[PDB]
Amino acid sequence: CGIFAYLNYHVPRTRREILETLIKGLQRLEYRGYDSAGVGFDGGNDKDWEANACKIQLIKKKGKVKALDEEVHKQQDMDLDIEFDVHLGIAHTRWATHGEPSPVNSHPQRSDKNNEFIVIHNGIITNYKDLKKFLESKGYDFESETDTETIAKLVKYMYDNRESQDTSFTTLVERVIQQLEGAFALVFKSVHFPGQAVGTRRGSPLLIGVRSEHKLSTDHIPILYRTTCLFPVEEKAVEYYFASDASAVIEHTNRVIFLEDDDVAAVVDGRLSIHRIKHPGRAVQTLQMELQQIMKGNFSSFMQKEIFEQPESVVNTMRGRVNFDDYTVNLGGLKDHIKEIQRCRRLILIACGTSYHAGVATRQVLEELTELPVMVELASDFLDRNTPVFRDDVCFFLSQSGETADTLMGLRYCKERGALTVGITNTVGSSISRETDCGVHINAGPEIGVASTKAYTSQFVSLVMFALMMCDDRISMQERRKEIMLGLKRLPDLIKEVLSMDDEIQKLATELYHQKSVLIMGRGYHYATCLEGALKIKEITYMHSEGILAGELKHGPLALVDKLMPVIMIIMRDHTYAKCQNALQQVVARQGRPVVICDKEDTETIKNTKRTIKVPHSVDCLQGILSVIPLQLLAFHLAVLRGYDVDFPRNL
Amino acid sequence: CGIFAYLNYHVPRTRREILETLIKGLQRLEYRGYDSAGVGFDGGNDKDWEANACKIQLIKKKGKVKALDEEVHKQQDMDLDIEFDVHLGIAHTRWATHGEPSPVNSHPQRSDKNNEFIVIHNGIITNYKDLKKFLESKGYDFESETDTETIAKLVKYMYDNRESQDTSFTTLVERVIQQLEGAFALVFKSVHFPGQAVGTRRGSPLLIGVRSEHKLSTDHIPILYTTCLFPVEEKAVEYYFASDASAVIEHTNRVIFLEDDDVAAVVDGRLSIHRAVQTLQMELQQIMKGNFSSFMQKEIFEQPESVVNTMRGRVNFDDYTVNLGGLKDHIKEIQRCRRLILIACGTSYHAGVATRQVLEELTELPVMVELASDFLDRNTPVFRDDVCFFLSQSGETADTLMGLRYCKERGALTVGITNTVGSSISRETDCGVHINAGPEIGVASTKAYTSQFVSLVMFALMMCDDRISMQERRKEIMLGLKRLPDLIKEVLSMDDEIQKLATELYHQKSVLIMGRGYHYATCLEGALKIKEITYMHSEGILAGELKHGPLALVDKLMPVIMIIMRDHTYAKCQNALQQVVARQGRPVVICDKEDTETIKNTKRTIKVPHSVDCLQGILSVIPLQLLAFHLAVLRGYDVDFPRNLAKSVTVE
Numbered sequence A: 001c002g003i004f005a006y007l008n009y010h011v012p013r014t015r016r017e018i019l020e021t022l023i024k025g026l027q028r029l030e031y032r033g034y035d036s037a038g039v040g041f042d043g044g045n046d047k048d049w050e051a052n053a054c055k056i057q058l059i060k061k062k063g064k065v066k067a068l069d070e071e072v073h074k075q076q077d078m079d080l081d082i083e084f085d086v087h088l089g090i091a092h093t094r095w096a097t098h099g100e101p102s103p104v105n106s107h108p109q110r111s112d113k114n115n116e117f118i119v120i121h122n123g124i125i126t127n128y129k130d131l132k133k134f135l136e137s138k139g140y141d142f143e144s145e146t147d148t149e150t151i152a153k154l155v156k157y158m159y160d161n162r163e164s165q166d167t168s169f170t171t172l173v174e175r176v177i178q179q180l181e182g183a184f185a186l187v188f189k190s191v192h193f194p195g196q197a198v199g200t201r202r203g204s205p206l207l208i209g210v211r212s213e214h215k216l217s218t219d220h221i222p223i224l225y226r227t228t229c230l231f232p233v234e235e236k237a238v239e240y241y242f243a244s245d246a247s248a249v250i251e252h253t254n255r256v257i258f259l260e261d262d263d264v265a266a267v268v269d270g271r272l273s274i275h276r277i278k279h280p281g282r283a284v285q286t287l288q289m290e291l292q293q294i295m296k297g298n299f300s301s302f303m304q305k306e307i308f309e310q311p312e313s314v315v316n317t318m319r320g321r322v323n324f325d326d327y328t329v330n331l332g333g334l335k336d337h338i339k340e341i342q343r344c345r346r347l348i349l350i351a352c353g354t355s356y357h358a359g360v361a362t363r364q365v366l367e368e369l370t371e372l373p374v375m376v377e378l379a380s381d382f383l384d385r386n387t388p389v390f391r392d393d394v395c396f397f398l399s400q401s402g403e404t405a406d407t408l409m410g411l412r413y414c415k416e417r418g419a420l421t422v423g424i425t426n427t428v429g430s431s432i433s434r435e436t437d438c439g440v441h442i443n444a445g446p447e448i449g450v451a452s453t454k455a456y457t458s459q460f461v462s463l464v465m466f467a468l469m470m471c472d473d474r475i476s477m478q479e480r481r482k483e484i485m486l487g488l489k490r491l492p493d494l495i496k497e498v499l500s501m502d503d504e505i506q507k508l509a510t511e512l513y514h515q516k517s518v519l520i521m522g523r524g525y526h527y528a529t530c531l532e533g534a535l536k537i538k539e540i541t542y543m544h545s546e547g548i549l550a551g552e553l554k555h556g557p558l559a560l561v562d563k564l565m566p567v568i569m570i571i572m573r574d575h576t577y578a579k580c581q582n583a584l585q586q587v588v589a590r591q592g593r594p595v596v597i598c599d600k601e602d603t604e605t606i607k608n609t610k611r612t613i614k615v616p617h618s619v620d621c622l623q624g625i626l627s628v629i630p631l632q633l634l635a636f637h638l639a640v641l642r643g644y645d646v647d648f649p650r651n652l
Numbered sequence B: 001c002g003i004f005a006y007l008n009y010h011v012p013r014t015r016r017e018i019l020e021t022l023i024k025g026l027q028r029l030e031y032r033g034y035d036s037a038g039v040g041f042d043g044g045n046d047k048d049w050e051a052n053a054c055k056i057q058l059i060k061k062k063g064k065v066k067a068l069d070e071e072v073h074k075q076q077d078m079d080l081d082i083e084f085d086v087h088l089g090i091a092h093t094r095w096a097t098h099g100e101p102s103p104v105n106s107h108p109q110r111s112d113k114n115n116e117f118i119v120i121h122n123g124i125i126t127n128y129k130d131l132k133k134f135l136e137s138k139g140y141d142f143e144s145e146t147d148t149e150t151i152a153k154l155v156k157y158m159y160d161n162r163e164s165q166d167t168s169f170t171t172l173v174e175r176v177i178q179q180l181e182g183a184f185a186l187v188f189k190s191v192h193f194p195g196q197a198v199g200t201r202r203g204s205p206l207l208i209g210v211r212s213e214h215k216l217s218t219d220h221i222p223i224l225y226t227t228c229l230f231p232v233e234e235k236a237v238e239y240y241f242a243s244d245a246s247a248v249i250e251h252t253n254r255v256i257f258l259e260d261d262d263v264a265a266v267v268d269g270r271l272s273i274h275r276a277v278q279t280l281q282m283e284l285q286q287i288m289k290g291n292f293s294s295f296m297q298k299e300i301f302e303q304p305e306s307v308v309n310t311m312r313g314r315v316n317f318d319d320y321t322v323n324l325g326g327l328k329d330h331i332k333e334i335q336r337c338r339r340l341i342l343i344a345c346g347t348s349y350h351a352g353v354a355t356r357q358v359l360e361e362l363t364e365l366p367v368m369v370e371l372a373s374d375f376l377d378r379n380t381p382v383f384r385d386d387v388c389f390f391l392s393q394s395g396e397t398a399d400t401l402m403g404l405r406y407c408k409e410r411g412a413l414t415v416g417i418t419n420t421v422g423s424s425i426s427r428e429t430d431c432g433v434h435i436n437a438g439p440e441i442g443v444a445s446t447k448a449y450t451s452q453f454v455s456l457v458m459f460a461l462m463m464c465d466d467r468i469s470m471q472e473r474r475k476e477i478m479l480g481l482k483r484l485p486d487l488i489k490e491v492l493s494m495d496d497e498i499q500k501l502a503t504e505l506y507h508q509k510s511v512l513i514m515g516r517g518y519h520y521a522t523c524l525e526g527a528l529k530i531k532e533i534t535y536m537h538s539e540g541i542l543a544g545e546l547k548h549g550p551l552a553l554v555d556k557l558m559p560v561i562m563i564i565m566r567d568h569t570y571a572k573c574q575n576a577l578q579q580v581v582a583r584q585g586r587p588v589v590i591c592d593k594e595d596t597e598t599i600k601n602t603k604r605t606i607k608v609p610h611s612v613d614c615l616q617g618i619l620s621v622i623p624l625q626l627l628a629f630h631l632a633v634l635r636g637y638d639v640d641f642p643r644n645l646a647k648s649v650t651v652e
């Protein structure tokens, strides 16, 4: 789940400093409720290194990384003062799956009782049964209930059967992954290759950070098949960081290499090369990420931080992309494709969960400004039906993580059929970001919370900005674009206005504290609002909230309304205003006493309804952002009132 | 909203026979609305009926028709023994979507405290506010908050400002409708015009039945701008104004289906139309419960028969041929189009969701499925080469009808899938199919859903009848249709097993119904049925979306129904079941009989027989229909008359 390794090559570090670096990396990767973690390093207290390289020591523990860090310093035999000019340490944090949390079942997994090979793994080996039986027939005894141990045992099998005494660490790993089936990200360490690391992935993210006070040989590592590698030019000193997430690297360096499926990256003599079995290469790029972005700060939870910082993340999404003087929108990621997109005949938005709601939330304005048909598909269903896709379709894939399975498989489906693919993602280097022809990084910052908050609103704004590009040549739409863009200009301050009503939301959370259901009703631009709000309250509050399209009430669902059923209705001053007034009269006529989220100046309804949240008025195709935030906050406060940890996931 | 009036010209009927006839006609229309009812007849207790037509009596009460039938009786002032040789009585049941269902807001409305003009109205007047102000200035006092009172107060304004002393009742009504906007179906009665009825319409149904032992003068009344329909040789005739054919079939099968702006009038027992007389293709048995306790139960258990009727004369199993006569002169042009759009509401929308996949498979065209209300809110792009389907049991749903006219304006080819011959949607569509499911009386659609399902499948079988590669697939499906009626009987034989399950859920507040693929519509339709008639908080959840939030709502106390069938999504649905169980859920599973795997590992299962994947949805939804039925009975509710709504939403 969380991989981190630190390789210091001719950068002298003490064992204390090394272990501190490993522990700190796991804290960046540790999320609420990780049960097992461990570290692997060179044991032995012989003065100076080189003699302590043939003693791999493991310290694994069941619990949080805090307990591990205490165990690290709770070692009487170890001396934390030895200095290593060259050393490789690896670490892992996990939520136990194949087995039960126990020190043995934690990572790293070892190849034997002397720890000749150890490995840390993210993923699942589907065929680990066949592999385990084979290794046992060849005489390898197992000790854990994990599929990872088969990896440690298999690499030693390849070593015990090597043809020459100097077969590379890379070759051994290559022979291992050939026998593996499923998804994996791996980092290997061995006494037979002191100071060397090998990292490889298949369907699981893995990256390498590099730092050196000296110039590096290149910024584009070429691939070697079965100048040519990265290394400090005029000196040896260099540091490498393997990790499954940039969060554990950004505080040490912002220069990273994203590995790809079946890449085998190896560090030999302090030099990094990337091998393949099959010119192309892997780029050393600069991440805009910052350590402060993955911290709670003064907020008591990541959910609270990411809700209340939405004035900032919205501004981050638009920076360098909008100009309110000449009313121009420039999404850099679509420069080399915007003209081709405009020659296509249909837009298909494919996503899961809240990302899908972002498409529902912008479907109308995309239809309005592109004038093309716009299909919005749930990825899982999109695949089940084998949806017809064509070469003149443009397919969008909305994914904060860029790794969701069904969305990624939908991407590959549409590529097979020759469609133009576009990514709306929030993770640089992710599978969906790489494999899409083009796209937009919404630049919302890392989303650490359990539920999507700023990602939904940054996706929202990103699609609106795209729609504004698609109509930049239409005279008849110049005024509509100005209205929308002046809405984006004012949007950050309007969000602050909504957040300032947090006290009113808590009063609503008190009303619904003891309730077991709540219907959220909306239509038009706010169909997505009531769907997203119902999902948030389900995911965070664990109560039965359901979004109901207002225009469907009189077709059945209205039967639920009575004096006891809590109802939240969204009524804004747009073209559907009178229709929403109609639905309100239908609810009240059946003893419903709903709460209404309406515009700040809607004096007509504020005097008729029980309780009303009064959000500020904005352009119709942006109101969804302002009207969903009270539902974000409502889920947060309800969960807190009930003693729940909003940063602790339940689905798992 | 239903209309019914009884005019017996020279056919002696006592005041008890007329009132019993008015109430009996409303009961035939009660399913179109049951929040209030009323009647309007002649008062006074004079043996000579001629000296009583100057006194109008209104009896209106809140509740169903049974509340009115008891209010009409046990009255100390109305002598039910007066013989009327000529009399006109109007009645009306109301679906109070707004305001209170009080007697004052019920119909017939009145023009003054003496009841000089009373009217019954079905629809909405879109400018009743401007008409109310004008009438209030001229000295007319209003009492109710309905839009129908503006029609009663206006016909008196045209009568108080007439040019000649003998302006026909038609002339007065003609001047009224010229000031009315929107849709309406009206039936007037006045003391100045004793026994004279006037029936006009505009966007609302309104027919006139006739019964007479004597020959009728003609069989095609000529419209005006050797003229009237009346008995030859004698005067005995009985008329039956009604907004539906079920209230007239019991007395006669000879009606006159008016058209928009046709002002029918019965003067001296002669029917004339200002500005056909066909036989009804309906039998009385089709609108009778028979041996069942409710119409819904009948219409569920008669699905084996209604499915056969939908295929009658259309599916030939000896040679595996499909021919839908309604699409004969259009099937070739439909194939040259580039997209299908299905537009409907509620259960009719689910019928499209249930057939979207197979339509995509056999036509290879894009298939977009739209909720009518949202389709209109977004101004969805439509083109000339679009084929737009409109699924409507009643053929009068406002939003579905608006979508039709919307698509027609953009030059799309429009196709109707309806169950009511001569309805708005059936007439205004270019072509279509009458599903021939028979009259549906229960508010909740049961046989209409499965008949729409089958009808869209038959269309798909036509669209691929020239593909060699699809021949075996067609035969597979058609064999499934041949076996479908008997498999429905097999499901119905499990009614008792369903009733037992109901006794284990009726006390619960919520139930989650989960499904994917072909059974996404099944869990959406079942959730809607349980909402509508049992008032449980039932929600359908696409199985593939569980891992994206909703799964957090599942615990050992949340009821869950899962649909796991033997199609290509079986392995994925087994994964969902495992997720639900990991969350401590104890789900009820609707699965296939041969699915011994699921049956063994689940204590509560409903085993339905196997069929073709694209037909299984018909068999999987029937248990949920029955479950909703039994749950409602256990909770003490009337399955035919659910609360807060009625059947057919003909007014938005």
Ligand SMILES: CC(=O)N[C@H]1[C@@H](OP(=O)(O)OP(=O)(O)OC[C@H]2O[C@@H](n3ccc(=O)[nH]c3=O)[C@H](O)[C@@H]2O)O[C@H](CO)[C@@H](O)[C@@H]1O
Pocket: A286, A288, A320, A331, A332, A333, A334, A422, A423, A424, A425, A428, A432, A433, A434, A436, A437, A438, A439, A440, A441, A442
């Ligand atoms: C990742 C990166 O270095 N982005 C830089 C880019 O931002 P810029 O906004 O110009 O472009 P993006 O960050 O949005 O995307 C970067 C590239 O990845 C592609 N892409 C992105 C998302 C996706 O889902 N699929 C996809 O293919 C884009 O088409 C584009 O070619 O120029 C800016 C300078 O003006 C820098 O501040 C940004 O650091």
Ligand SMILES: CC(=O)N[C@H]1[C@@H](OP(=O)(O)OP(=O)(O)OC[C@H]2O[C@@H](n3ccc(=O)[nH]c3=O)[C@H](O)[C@@H]2O)O[C@H](CO)[C@@H](O)[C@@H]1O
Pocket: B313, B324, B325, B326, B327, B415, B416, B417, B418, B421, B425, B426, B427, B429, B430, B431, B432, B433, B434, B435
């Ligand atoms: C109403 C009628 O007399 N139908 C006859 C017709 O049925 P048949 O099955 O041939 O055609 P339908 O009854 O389904 O429809 C009748 C006509 O109305 C049109 N239409 C129907 C539904 C709709 O929603 N929109 C629309 O425009 C059809 O295109 C068609 O032109 O031939 C059969 C003999 O084989 C007879 O048993 C049916 O009595």
Ligand SMILES: O=C[C@H](O)[C@@H](O)[C@H](O)[C@H](O)COP(=O)(O)O
Pocket: A352, A353, A354, A355, A356, A398, A399, A400, A401, A402, A403, A404, A407, A450, A451, A452, A539, B547, B548, B549
């Ligand atoms: O709050 C809910 C979750 O965020 C849920 O909606 C879903 O898991 C994502 O929205 C989709 O995942 P990606 O956004 O990473 O594609």
Ligand SMILES: O=C[C@H](O)[C@@H](O)[C@H](O)[C@H](O)COP(=O)(O)O
Pocket: A554, A555, A556, B345, B346, B347, B348, B391, B392, B393, B394, B395, B396, B397, B400, B443, B444, B445, B446, B528, B529, B532, B648, B649
């Ligand atoms: O059980 C629910 C009802 O059947 C309802 O959903 C109905 O389908 C629509 O309200 C109108 O649709 P029609 O136009 O087909 O009558």
Ligand SMILES: [Mg+2]
Pocket: A433, A434, A435, A436, A437, A438
């Ligand atoms: Mg890319």
Ligand SMILES: [Mg+2]
Pocket: B426, B427, B428, B429, B430, B431, B432
């Ligand atoms: Mg027609």
